[PDB]
From Swiss-Prot, chains A, B:
Annotated protein name in UniProt: Phosphonoacetaldehyde hydrolase
Entry's cofactor comment: Binds 1 Mg(2+) ion per subunit.
GO biological process, one term: organic phosphonate catabolic process
Cross-referenced InterPro entries: HAD-like_hydrolase_sf, HAD-like_sf, HAD-SF_hydro_IA, HAD_sf, PGP-like_dom2, Phosphonoacetald_hydro
Species name: Bacillus cereus
SUPFAM superfamilies for this protein: HAD-like (SSF56784)
Outcome recorded upon mutating residue 45 to L: Kcat/KM decreases 17000-fold
Reactions catalysed: phosphonoacetaldehyde + H2O = acetaldehyde + phosphate + H(+)
Family: Belongs to the HAD-like hydrolase superfamily. PhnX family.
């Protein structure tokens, strides 16, 4: 019996394609000569934003530039400074990226009718979530609980946020819970948490596509991109992979049998 | 691979036979004119002390008698009142019951040599543990971390405290941890938390015998009560049972395969 589902936020319940952080991540590196790609900017998506900045400076290709430019590799000063700007730019647009993804609300309402708790973990800080959650609620979305990396010792890939969700929801064991995410870090989080782990494809950070891009992309080109994402989720621990949240119910039924 | 081991306190690491509260639970019920057996007083051993008193007033036999004497079932005021008496008495003699069991420290140090994290959960309140922890640490025992029901939403059999241990000890998944306990509620905590659950017999609250009673007893009767406890632990989820802590190491190595 699955008693609770723990949802990721960006790329899973709100912000289709997880675009809020994408342009900001590139902006803070561009202003210094390092032109990171969208694909690199998306690789560590899901972890705490500051950890994400660090992960980017860690990547060989990104560290390669920086060193050759500033004549030295990134230091804790360079990370903290860019993250600082990340926040200033992020906070101004953040209210715009809290729109519940297309069919998530109906799935949430469906899970509640059945008495399934609605938990959630995040890559955003608490300060960011006061904005995201308030704005999302205005738009019709508010989970039963919400834990940010600020509430536990560390964010993803660690299962700490998931454990806190369980405590406050009163659900045990962990296998009585499903974790639904859209990034590679969400999958590692679910598995490290010992919970049934699901990956959403459309609207995910891993696809990196906007709604319009999905609706207008060549059908074959899309599927090709969908399988790449599905395979990525699988290689990274996903027990299940769903194209949209509309299949969540099916995964739940499968698990219970 | 087992990365950490969580131990119960009274009856597992310290206070052989778990006698510290036994006569207290008995004293507070006898005062009200409702006598309770040692077996009854021990059945819910492990739960947060206050929860333990509520569990006693919950037991059909005890509830029946109270209804006979007072013409009503125990009130929250009664439980609250009894618990106030439980503390006043328990505190005065707590220090005397916080001494490590014969050969536990040996296994403990042997585990630390193998790079193993040592966590702990309890039924004693934080305030209560301050006394036990300080005194226990004076006699050679001090785990890497300790959690009480005051730290989480509820104590045993809930797995909350264990998750806290997991968070703070940076270990995951839960099955990379072993829960070592001596009560039924300890077995339930381990299983509820998704970890390797092991019950210790000699010195457990489930045995209820002191060291002298164990040695001064016939080898037929001892191997009779040990089998009762062993069967109790197992029927309650224990994966493995050990007569003494010196068998833990083997259980681990067994699990590694
Ligand atoms: Mg996510
Ligand atoms: Mg115990």
């Amino acid at each position: 019996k699955i008693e609770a589902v723990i949802f990721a936020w960006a790329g899973t319940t709100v912000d289709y394609g997880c675009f809020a952080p994408l342009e900001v991540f590139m902006e803070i590196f561009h202003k210094r000569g390092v032109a990171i790609t969208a694909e690199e900017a998306r690789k560590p998506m899901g972890l705490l934003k500051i950890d994400h900045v660090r992960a980017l400076t860690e990547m060989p290709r990104i560290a390669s530039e920086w060193n050759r430019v500033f004549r030295q590799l990134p230091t804790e000063a360079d990370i903290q400074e860019m993250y600082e700007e990340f926040e200033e730019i992020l906070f101004a647009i953040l209210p715009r990226y809290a729109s519940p993804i297309n069919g998530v609300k109906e799935v949430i309402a469906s899970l509640r009718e059945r008495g399934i708790k609605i938990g959630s973990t995040t890559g955003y800080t608490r300060e960011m979530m006061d904005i995201v959650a308030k704005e999302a609620a205005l738009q019709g979305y508010k989970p039963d609980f919400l834990v940010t990396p600020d509430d536990v010792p560390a964010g993803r890939p660690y299962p700490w946020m998931c454990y806190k969700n369980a405590m406050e929801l009163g659900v045990y064991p962990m296998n009585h819970m499903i974790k639904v995410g859209d990034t590679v870090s969400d999958m590692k989080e679910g598995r490290n948490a010992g919970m049934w782990t699901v990956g959403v494809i459309l609207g995910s950070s891993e696809l990196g596509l906007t709604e319009e891009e999905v609706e207008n992309m060549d059908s074959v080109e899309l599927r090709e991109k969908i399988e790449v994402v599905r395979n990525r989720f699988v290689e990274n621990g996903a027990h299940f992979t769903i194209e949209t949240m509309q299949e969540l119910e099916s995964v739940m039924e499968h698990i219970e049998k």
